[PDB]
Amino acid sequence: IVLSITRLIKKYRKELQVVAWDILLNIIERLLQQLQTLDSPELRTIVHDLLTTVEELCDQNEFHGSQERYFELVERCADQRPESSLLNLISYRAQSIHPAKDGWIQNLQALMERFFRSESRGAVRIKVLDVLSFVLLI
Amino acid sequence: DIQMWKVSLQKEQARYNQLQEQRDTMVTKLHSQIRQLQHDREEFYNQSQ
Amino acid sequence: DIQMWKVSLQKEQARYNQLQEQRDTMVTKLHSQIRQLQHDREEFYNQSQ
């Protein structure tokens, strides 16, 4: 499944529009729930590569799906190995934190409570604090 | 699939319509920043000049 | 008709992207030209004067 969906996403980046992505994100959600117990290094590697390609396509903005749910799924798997993915996730979640937007302080609270005050990956916490600095400068 | 694209356009149009609330919110933010800028400048004159 | 609705929803997506870019650009302009200007004019200029 993960190999075939890898060719699906890496090729048909654009044809996957939002209802299809709402399905395909749940496909990834099931895959991630299985990643806990399937345990194989090869499966870990290929699932990580898939989410890495989804992240790349999100930076390329070739991904057109729901960022809220995709980055929620990233958050559930945030506890995992990929490093730059965490930087991307934190930078993304910064968007929902802004003085004009509702609940922004609470969203920032959650962001730091997860990735600042319950985290130890130095670059990740550096980026969280840079995000907070950008929020304060804004 | 026609029904799907219709529901999909409905949903993305709702997402784009929430930016109407976003527009009103940013207009309020402007009506704070600009209005306080004008008040600050006028009192800056009225006292410091 | 499927292709036509695909490009129609794509145009709605384009309007969303354009509106997001325009709101981001106008927020940047508001910041750097009104909020930063007020920061100067009040906190530095008015209070120092």
Which member of A18, A100, A101 has the closest CB to residue B12?
A: A18
- Please report, to the nearest 10 degrees, the dihedral formed by the alpha carbons of residues C11, C16, C19, C21 taken in order: -100
Report helix, strand or coil for B49.
coil
**Residues composing chain C:** 49
A6 is written with which tokens? 């890898």
Tell me the shortest Cα–Cα distance from A89 to chain C, in angstroms: 19
Residue of A nearest to B24 (CA): A100
Determine contact: B24 vs chain C, CB below 8 A: no
Chain B residues lying within 8 Å of C13, measured CB to CB: 12
Overall resolution, Å: 2.9
Tell me the shortest Cα–Cα distance from B49 to chain A, in angstroms: 30
Note whether A38 and A68 are within 8 A (CB).
Answer: no
B19 is written with which tokens? 């930016």
Determine contact: B8 vs chain A, CB below 8 A: yes
DSSP letter for C45, please: I
DSSP letter for C49, please: -
Chain B residues lying within 8 Å of A101, measured CB to CB: 25
How were these coordinates obtained? cryo-EM
Amino acid at C33: Q
Determine contact: C31 vs chain A, CB below 8 A: yes
Contacts of B5 (CB under 8 A, 6+ apart): C2, C5, C6, C8, C9
Q: b or e along C12-44 (b: 16 or more beta carbons within 10 Å of the residue's beta carbon)?
A: bbeebeeeeeeeeeebeebeeeebeebeebbee
| SS3 assignment for chain A | CHHHHHHHHHHCCCCCCHHHHHHHHHHHHHHHHHHHHHCCHHHHHHHHHHHHHHHHHHHCCCCCCCHHHHHHHHHHCCCCCCCHHHHHHHHHHHCCCCCCCCCHHHHHHHHHHHHCCCCCCHHHHHHHHHHHHHHHHC
